[PDB]
Design an enzyme around this catalytic site. Structure first.
Site, short mmCIF file in Angstrom:
data_model
loop_
_atom_site.label_atom_id
_atom_site.label_comp_id
_atom_site.label_asym_id
_atom_site.label_seq_id
_atom_site.Cartn_x
_atom_site.Cartn_y
_atom_site.Cartn_z
N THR A 1 -6.12 -11.33 -9.45
CA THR A 1 -7.41 -10.76 -9.81
C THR A 1 -7.35 -9.29 -10.21
OG1 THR A 1 -9.71 -10.52 -9.09
CG2 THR A 1 -7.99 -10.08 -7.48
N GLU B 1 -15.62 0.90 1.15
CA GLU B 1 -16.78 0.44 0.40
C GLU B 1 -17.88 0.00 1.36
OE1 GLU B 1 -15.60 -2.31 -2.59
OE2 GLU B 1 -17.49 -2.18 -3.70
N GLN C 1 -11.88 -5.55 1.74
CA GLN C 1 -12.79 -6.66 1.49
C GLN C 1 -12.22 -7.97 2.01
OE1 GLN C 1 -14.33 -7.11 -2.56
NE2 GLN C 1 -15.98 -8.26 -1.58
N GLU D 1 5.95 -13.55 23.07
CA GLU D 1 6.92 -14.61 22.85
C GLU D 1 7.10 -14.94 21.37
OE1 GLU D 1 5.86 -17.95 25.24
OE2 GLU D 1 6.41 -16.96 27.12
N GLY E 1 -6.48 -0.91 -2.77
CA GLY E 1 -6.34 0.42 -2.18
C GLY E 1 -6.83 0.49 -0.75
N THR E 2 -8.01 -0.07 -0.48
CA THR E 2 -8.55 -0.06 0.87
C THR E 2 -7.62 -0.80 1.83
OG1 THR E 2 -9.93 -1.92 0.18
CG2 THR E 2 -10.95 0.25 0.27
N1 LIG Z 1 -7.58 -14.65 0.97
C1 LIG Z 1 -8.58 -13.87 0.57
N2 LIG Z 1 -8.32 -12.76 -0.20
C2 LIG Z 1 -9.32 -11.96 -0.61
C3 LIG Z 1 -10.63 -12.24 -0.26
N3 LIG Z 1 -11.42 -11.30 -0.79
C4 LIG Z 1 -10.65 -10.42 -1.47
N4 LIG Z 1 -9.35 -10.83 -1.38
C5 LIG Z 1 -8.17 -10.16 -1.95
O1 LIG Z 1 -8.27 -8.77 -1.67
C6 LIG Z 1 -7.81 -8.00 -2.76
C7 LIG Z 1 -8.60 -6.70 -2.85
O2 LIG Z 1 -9.08 -6.36 -1.57
P1 LIG Z 1 -9.64 -4.89 -1.24
O3 LIG Z 1 -8.60 -3.84 -1.50
O4 LIG Z 1 -10.09 -4.84 0.19
O5 LIG Z 1 -10.92 -4.68 -2.19
P2 LIG Z 1 -11.96 -3.50 -1.84
O6 LIG Z 1 -12.64 -3.70 -0.51
O7 LIG Z 1 -12.97 -3.35 -2.95
O8 LIG Z 1 -11.02 -2.20 -1.79
P3 LIG Z 1 -10.23 -1.70 -3.09
O9 LIG Z 1 -10.08 -2.85 -4.05
O10 LIG Z 1 -8.86 -1.22 -2.68
O11 LIG Z 1 -10.97 -0.57 -3.74
C8 LIG Z 1 -7.97 -8.88 -3.99
O12 LIG Z 1 -6.81 -8.81 -4.77
C9 LIG Z 1 -8.13 -10.29 -3.46
O13 LIG Z 1 -7.01 -11.06 -3.84
C10 LIG Z 1 -10.90 -13.36 0.53
O14 LIG Z 1 -12.05 -13.62 0.85
N5 LIG Z 1 -9.87 -14.17 0.94
#
Ligand SMILES: Nc1nc2c(ncn2[C@@H]2O[C@H](COP(=O)(O)OP(=O)(O)OP(=O)(O)O)[C@@H](O)[C@H]2O)c(=O)[nH]1
Ligand SMILES: Nc1nc2c(ncn2[C@@H]2O[C@H](COP(=O)(O)OP(=O)(O)OP(=O)(O)O)[C@@H](O)[C@H]2O)c(=O)[nH]1
Ligand SMILES: Nc1nc2c(ncn2[C@@H]2O[C@H](COP(=O)(O)OP(=O)(O)O)[C@@H](O)[C@H]2O)c(=O)[nH]1
Ligand SMILES: Nc1nc2c(ncn2[C@@H]2O[C@H](COP(=O)(O)OP(=O)(O)O)[C@@H](O)[C@H]2O)c(=O)[nH]1
Lengths: 101, 430, 51, 431, 431, 430
Positions: free
Chosen positions: B171, B63, B11, B246, B136-137
């Site tokens: 989070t 997802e 995400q 570089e 996880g993703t």
């Molecule tokens: N900097 C930043 N971090 C983000 C943003 N959106 C989500 N995150 C971080 O991404 C983490 C989770 O990402 P993902 O693992 O991809 O969430 P997901 O796509 O539902 O996949 P899973 O949670 O593993 O099931 C969270 O702990 C957030 O801190 C964003 O827009 N900007």
């Protein structure tokens, strides 16, 4: 047109996100809109404030925003209507989400 | 000729990719439909016979929601529909789920499309992997993809712009777990890992942009600006051109030490613009300020090992030399004894483009400071006790065990992170 | 395809947009056939039938 | 495209499910005739999570309505959204369980469970991908508890990896409706501990409290309690149905909530629940939502969190909101109430954000808290079960259905072991 | 951005505060529904001093209304400007204090004081920077004086450095409204001396004299007296809310007024008070305002300044005026009435000028006099309190609420100490 | 090259700064927006990239109202937003409040901005501190800032244009208290302190300007004209060029005796203008008249030590020489025996510009007479008993004690002022 409705929703959402970034920022921006001592916001004041915001929007769409913000058919924006249309979420979020309407 | 393949996993990856590709389209003049009204787009877009430009990107997620948001947003006709790859079940913040059970077929198809994209590139500077360490993703599937890329492509430079958990604000709950696991994974595969923290970018947005209510769109806009400044030398000519290859030669002293702090300057909204000088020296000082750093890690605790500066816009080499000399003479900034130079300056004549509707203002000068420093061991020290506090009670361990892991994997990840801690301590010490 | 060609997410597309979609599906389709199907789907509309 | 199979069990479960489906259809813009009348693309974008398309535009719930007496689902069909449901999904017997878990699990539930499993399997096989099942029912009732536990066991056997979510209306602490509530609850909790992956505990008296103190209602009927339960049931899964700034599915919530497999009982609450008078007056902000959700009075569980310690807690927000604002508010909550939060977990909060608020509300937020407070609820139910079981009152009704006395003792032992684990993790010290 | 938390106590305090909030809303262009309608920018610049931003354009007073009986604030809420207040700020009991200070301070106010301080803390923490609190109430009344003194003590404990301003309606000399006025006044003066940083002394009979002589009303109801008191209360803080040529905050007034910490009681007045007959005949000029200001009849306090000597005197002018005119007028006043001004203070005037006069007056002025004249008022309270305390009349009620007899003697001892302080500074000679 | 940093502390400082900067903008042609349609502005203004001129001034106050008046007024686009520094709580006429408790963070930020401003100057003639002796912000914060500037900057000449309490008329009650405290503070920290009295300026407005209702704007306009006439030689060339550094060398016979009377001439309205000759001799005589002095102190009581004359406009060295010779031969004006010359004449070719809407007339000649004289000990004698009369009763002493002061500090300030009285008597003596 759905394109115009989406444009209005997106523009109102953009303004509401630019404002409301901190507490009373809506009030500060409202006070900065008008050079004059009256709280009523003129059309020229509205265009100048939108130009102060780093937003590239045509005069026609700015006038659409001015009319949509209820002038009470008076032609000047009050603080009440300013807040009513530039609240966080509310009408802006509803219009942004309601695409099929 | 200077093509770079973009990978966005999870995400966070997809959401920063939205901002990144919006920024690139704005920079190169490419309309959201795909085509523009030379060859500066070759690094990020490949042109077809019809004139339509398609990005050399790959949006990977288990997802469907985030990818369908791209499929339904403004950028529908831009991206390649098959390049958008979606899973059926989310990894549910489980590194095991994203690395052992669900991620297998998805990453296999990701390698397939990555191979198809790489076959379209005459040259290939490398890969830009944008994932989320702490989910996880992002963690599991991203780690698996990085491992496969290391196995097959080999020496191509993989630059991972990872987003780590913030020190106290967060989070997720198992975020220390999957963060430690993915850290063990990417210690040995990625070439340069650019570290990012949401708390740090939130503080940047609060102090510099005066946004007391920052959101992920703002964070992604800042990250996209950083990456665009980083890649500007690939697309636009400039004095002191700096290359992807570089970066590591001027920034990586030892292979184990390749994690990089990033800091952008100036960060000024529309209202505050054109009110201060914003000279080269002032923006360099702002970039070296701890508050402008995009990682919750005070550089004063550690010592800088190398600092690569990307200047964009009207920057003259005499001014950059004067500013860097002032930084060197400054007592607060401390460098390691074994790197007397410790600086890699590079200028580009293209000023940073401003996203319409964003908070950033139009500035004629910009600095992206990417530094290898031993201070970064502090954040790993934080995660190392956040992990072990949970792992003493084996909380949430069964969730990871159920999808094909063992306690030995957790033990090995913790041991490797401790080894990295000691390596940072050793390189910092005389 | 209709969703990709519908920028406003309004569920409705013009004649040109749905003819483009139908040509992307099957190249041989002309605009008159698509318009006829549009009319038989929604009898009284000023274009923009729901795809 | 991650489908959920909803099941309703018993009188209370069926009525709660009817209210929940009314709420979901309203949210997705579905009229009682099933045709979409919502005028919003995101409503139909993920309508397949709960609904399937018929020959026409009709959209029907993926719901399976279970009972041993027909009058309850006659009323369900007579309800405002009674004809959306597939008529084939109404599985009912002829004679109801006389508030007898033994009757609902062994004698009368055995015959109808085959048809129930057939309907469940038919609904599951049509799904592209299956997130899992959600079973809404009431502990302390014959058909509800018995058939629910039996069906949960069967579904666990058939689909072990698929998620299982339960909305169990635990019998109320003070004012009990039926006499054999302790027996049914004790026998059902033992099954739920072993089988149910994720469980929400609800109390009629807790709902009555929230409707007098937050909502300030006067003579609220069961429709209002079902309405609030429906709100929670919708809000827990709104991330699947709507795009989210930080989305989180049921499996993500379970992974972030359950530290150890047996500690899967959670208390839930919904915000913002406010009275009519102060609606113009209350400030619709993320801090206000957090202040309301972390209140003990907002909980739909009878146990108050102040006595216990928060093992984990997920908050799913809905509305265009600042992720920084949310994260800062919940970090501040942790720092302020660190005494109520478990020490050996650095962060006890799972934040999820969805971009679509529920209809009518500018904002919303649903809370799911795993805390050792529910220990006192289970303790009270054990205090009643032991009181009756010492003198073996009403035990002959269950014994005549062909269950050993040993099952009661085993259920009590398992329930007490769960209580002991909750106390152990309440008073566990780091290092 | 220096916020003021308003508090109203008792029936008299609630009525006065309601009139005050009506006046302030009128000054800031706020309609009873809360929307700003001033069409005037300086009105909204510092509106946060008294009001908070609601969800809409509505503004809510930062006011906390307290009582032990519901009737007073039922009337307040149903009044013309009752809808602005947050209903959560109405903290009241069921049984009123029967004009019993012991009841309002120990028995009945003590349970309510927890909620009172909870609301006070909620309102104060939202403030960016807090100037302090202003409490309007009446000495000589049970709930008002008792809970006001208790709340002032609690807030003094919580926020020692923050300013405390009190507007107390002291019982009138010649006609007494309640029988136990001397007990209540003696007990409340003891608390105000120790806790309240700045206190304003008001008298109903003096208000009647001023409104019948200068204003010349025929039947001045309590609304008119409350309007006078509200005019003074607004004018005391107008320098915070409006730009001033020589601005002066509450702390500046306190520093320039109070020579010694316990001599913080002041007599106040408002100018120009004109009868409707002579509005045209009068000349609205700075010398006229000063002459009417320094008249003994213009003093809202029963004690006349002629018997005493002015320790200090602040004059907050409002309007476009010449600071030379103002300063020369006050210097001329001091030189002319040097007998009435203390010798060992070289300059006895703190002149403040605000650029925004109240609506309707081109120029206005509120006067705050610290003079030894209040000695005779405290003396009269002594003469009444001792008269009743000799025979213990009405004392058994205060005894039965759990108050020692020695609390009364301590209160009157401190009040006599204040009397003798005023005398000693009145007759104190330089060198 | 000849930069001077201006500081305005307190309400009076900021309000006289409004007039001063209006006067400088009108003099140099700088529009209120910031820019003008050679390099004579460098003493007060530094030009930026857009061509906008920003003043080298710092508006410091603990009260937000006075600064917000500038932030909203016509000079909102001229001054730097961070140059306008606002506190949260006013000093409430408490020297302890403005010097010990509230003023700390504000003065730290003030030194930060002052360092930023000074780093923008090649040279730095010195500081012009404009405050109000007689208020917490003016006295306490100004004293603290002067102390910090003396500590760090060192040799920069600090000229304090202090506004002291009037003899009989006054608006504050603790005014003698904080005036004595601030006088003790600046006796050792300022280099040249200029006395101003509102009563004397009111008398000047009443008689010379025929204004029966003078106000603060009028007073500040006269003060601004005096200061501009003082600095005119820095910005404009003329015969007998006068310098900030040589104010001392020509004016301060001993470092303690650096308090200075100021008198402007002519002070005439438009209607009375062009009605008299206004020759150099007449205007010099008017400047030496007791009524023209901006301090309620009879010069005939004491003896002049030094007199620096700043002429503006058509003034010839013969005219100034003849006028000063007549003044010396005059019997009423008495100089000390040890300073036979005692005169520093300096002419400027730039006549004083007239602020539109003001009462001062367009005069082709102007004189600013700044005199070091022993008569000024007389107003100090006034304040010295106004202090001790209240100090006997310790009136308002608890207010000052509460914010971290002691009875010893009042005693030391009063004793230092007594030592200054003794010093004045000795230097007047032969
Ligand atoms: N900097 C930043 N971090 C983000 C943003 N959106 C989500 N995150 C971080 O991404 C983490 C989770 O990402 P993902 O693992 O991809 O969430 P997901 O796509 O539902 O996949 P899973 O949670 O593993 O099931 C969270 O702990 C957030 O801190 C964003 O827009 N900007
Ligand atoms: N000549 C002149 N004097 C002024 C003017 N404004 C204020 N003063 C004097 O300044 C003194 C008080 O100034 P300040 O101390 O800055 O007042 P403040 O800004 O509220 O700060 P504090 O009073 O210290 O809390 C008063 O005694 C006035 O006599 C002005 O415009 N012209
Ligand atoms: N919230 C809610 N609770 C109910 C409702 N109907 C019954 N209950 C409660 O649920 C408990 C169990 O009843 P139930 O299991 O439905 O009876 P059964 O279906 O015959 O087994 C009873 O004690 C009721 O108090 C309802 O509509 N809403
Ligand atoms: N100015 C004014 N004074 C009042 C009003 N109502 C009551 N008072 C005075 O307040 C004094 C005390 O009454 P109060 O304290 O309110 O009684 P309590 O509410 O029972 O404590 C009485 O002597 C009244 O004269 C009013 O509306 N205006």
């Amino acid at each position: 047109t759905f394109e115009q409705a989406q444009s209005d929703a997106l523009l109102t959402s953009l303004m509401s996100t630019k404002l409301n970034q901190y507490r009373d920022k809506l009030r500060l921006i409202f006070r900065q809109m008008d050079g004059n001592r009256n709280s009523l916001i003129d059309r020229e004041e509205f265009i100048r404030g939108i130009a102060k915001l780093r937003i590239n929007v045509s005069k026609a769409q700015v006038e659409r925003l001015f009319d949509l913000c209820d002038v009470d058919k008076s032609g000047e924006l009050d603080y009440e209507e300013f807040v009513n249309r530039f609240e966080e979420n509310g009408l802006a979020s509803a219009a942004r989400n309601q695409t099929r309407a | 000729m200077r093509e770079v393949i973009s990978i966005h996993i999870g995400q966070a990856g997809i959401q920063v990719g939205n901002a990144c590709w919006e920024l690139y389209c704005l920079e190169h003049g490419i309309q959201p439909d795909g085509q523009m009204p030379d060859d500066a787009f070759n690094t990020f877009f490949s042109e077809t016979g019809a004139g339509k430009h398609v990005p050399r990107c790959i949006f990977l997620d288990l997802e469907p929601t985030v990818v369908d948001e791209v499929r339904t947003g403004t950028y529908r006709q831009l991206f390649h529909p098959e390049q958008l790859i979606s899973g059926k079940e989310d990894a549910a913040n489980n590194f095991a789920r994203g690395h052992y059970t669900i991620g297998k077929e998805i990453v296999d198809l990701a390698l397939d499309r990555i191979r198809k994209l790489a076959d379209n590139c005459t040259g290939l500077q490398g890969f830009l992997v944008f994932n989320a360490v702490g989910g996880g993703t992002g963690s599991g599937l991203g780690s698996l993809l990085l491992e496969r890329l290391s196995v097959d492509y080999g020496k191509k430079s993989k630059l991972g712009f990872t987003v780590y958990p913030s020190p106290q604000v967060s989070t997720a709950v198992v975020e220390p777990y999957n963060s430690v696991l993915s850290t063990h994974s990417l210690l040995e595969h990625t070439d340069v890992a650019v570290m990012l923290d949401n708390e740090a970018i939130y503080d940047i947005c609060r102090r510099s942009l005066d946004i007391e209510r920052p959101t992920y769109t703002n964070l992604n806009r800042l990250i996209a600006q950083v990456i665009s400044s980083l890649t500007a030398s690939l697309r636009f000519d400039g004095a002191l051109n700096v290359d992807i290859t570089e970066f590591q030669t001027n920034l990586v002293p030892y292979p184990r030490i390749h994690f990089m702090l990033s800091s952008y300057a100036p960060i000024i909204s529309a209202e505050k613009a054109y009110h201060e000088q914003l000279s080269v020296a002032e923006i360099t000082n702002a970039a070296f300020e701890p508050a402008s750093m995009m990682v919750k890690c005070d550089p004063r605790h550690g010592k800088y090992m190398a600092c690569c500066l990307m200047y964009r816009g009207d920057v003259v080499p005499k001014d950059v030399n004067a500013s860097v000399a002032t930084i060197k003479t400054k007592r607060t900034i401390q460098f390691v004894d074994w790197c007397p130079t410790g600086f890699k300056c590079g200028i580009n004549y293209q000023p940073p483009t401003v996203v319409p509707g964003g908070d950033l203002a139009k500035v004629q000068r910009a600095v992206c400071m990417i530094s290898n420093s031993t201070a970064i061991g502090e954040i790993f020290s934080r995660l190392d006790h956040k992990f072990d506090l949970m792992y003493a009670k084996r909380a949430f361990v069964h969730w990871y065990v159920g999808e094909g892991m063992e306690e030995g994997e957790f033990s090995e990840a913790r041991e490797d992170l401790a080894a990295l801690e000691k390596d940072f301590e050793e390189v910092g010490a005389e | 395809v209709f969703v990709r060609n519908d920028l406003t997410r309004c569920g409705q597309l013009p004649v040109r947009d749905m003819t483009r979609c139908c040509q992307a599906l099957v190249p041989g389709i002309s605009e008159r056939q698509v318009a006829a199907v549009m009319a038989v789907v929604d009898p009284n509309s000023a274009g923009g039938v729901d795809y | 495209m991650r489908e959920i199979v909803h099941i309703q069990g018993g009188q209370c479960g069926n009525q709660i499910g009817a209210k929940f489906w009314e709420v979901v259809s309203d949210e997705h813009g579905i009229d009682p005739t099933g045709t979409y009348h919502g005028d919003s693309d995101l409503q139909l974008e993920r309508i397949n999570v709960y609904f399937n398309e018929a020959t026409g535009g009709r959209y029907v719930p993926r719901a399976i309505l279970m009972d041993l007496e027909p009058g309850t689902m006659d009323s369900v069909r007579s309800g405002p959204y009674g004809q959306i449901f597939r008529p084939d999904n109404f599985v009912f017997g002829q004679t109801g369980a006389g508030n007898n878990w033994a009757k609902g699990h062994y004698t009368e539930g055995a015959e109808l469970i085959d048809s129930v499993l057939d309907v469940v399997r038919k609904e599951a096989e049509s799904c592209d991908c299956l997130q899992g099942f959600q079973v809404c029912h009431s502990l302390g009732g014959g058909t509800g508890s018995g058939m629910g536990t039996l069906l949960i066991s069967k579904i666990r056997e058939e689909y072990p990896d698929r998620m299982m979510l339960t909305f169990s209306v635990v019998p109320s602490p003070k004012v009990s409706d039926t006499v054999v509530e302790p027996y049914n609850a004790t026998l059902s909790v033992h099954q739920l501990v072993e089988n149910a992956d994720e469980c929400m505990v609800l109390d009629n008296e807790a709902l009555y409290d929230i409707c007098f103190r937050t909502l300030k209602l006067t003579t609220p009927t069961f429709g209002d309690l079902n309405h609030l339960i429906s709100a929670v049931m919708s809000g827990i899964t709104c991330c699947l149905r709507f795009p989210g700034q930080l989305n989180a599915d049921l499996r993500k919530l379970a992974v972030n909530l359950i530290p150890f497999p047996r500690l899967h009982f959670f208390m839930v609450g919904f915000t913002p629940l406010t009275s009519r008078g102060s609606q113009q007056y209350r400030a619709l902000t993320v801090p206000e939502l957090t202040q309301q959700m972390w209140d003990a009075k907002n909980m739909m569980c009878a146990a108050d969190p102040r006595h216990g310690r928060y093992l984990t807690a997920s908050a799913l927000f809905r509305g265009r909101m600042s992720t920084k604002e949310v994260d800062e508010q919940m970090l501040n909550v942790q720092n302020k109430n660190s005494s109520y939060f478990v020490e050996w977990i650095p962060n006890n909060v799972k934040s999820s954000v969805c971009d679509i608020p529920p209809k009518g509300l500018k904002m919303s937020a649903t809370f799911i808290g795993n805390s050792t407070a529910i220990q006192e609820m289970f303790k009270r139910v054990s205090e009643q079960f032991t009181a009756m079981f010492r003198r073996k009152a009403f035990l002959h009704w269950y014994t005549g259905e062909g269950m050993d006395e040993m099952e009661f003792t085993e259920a009590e032992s398992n329930m007490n072991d769960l209580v002991s684990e909750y106390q152990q993790y309440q008073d566990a010290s780091a290092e």
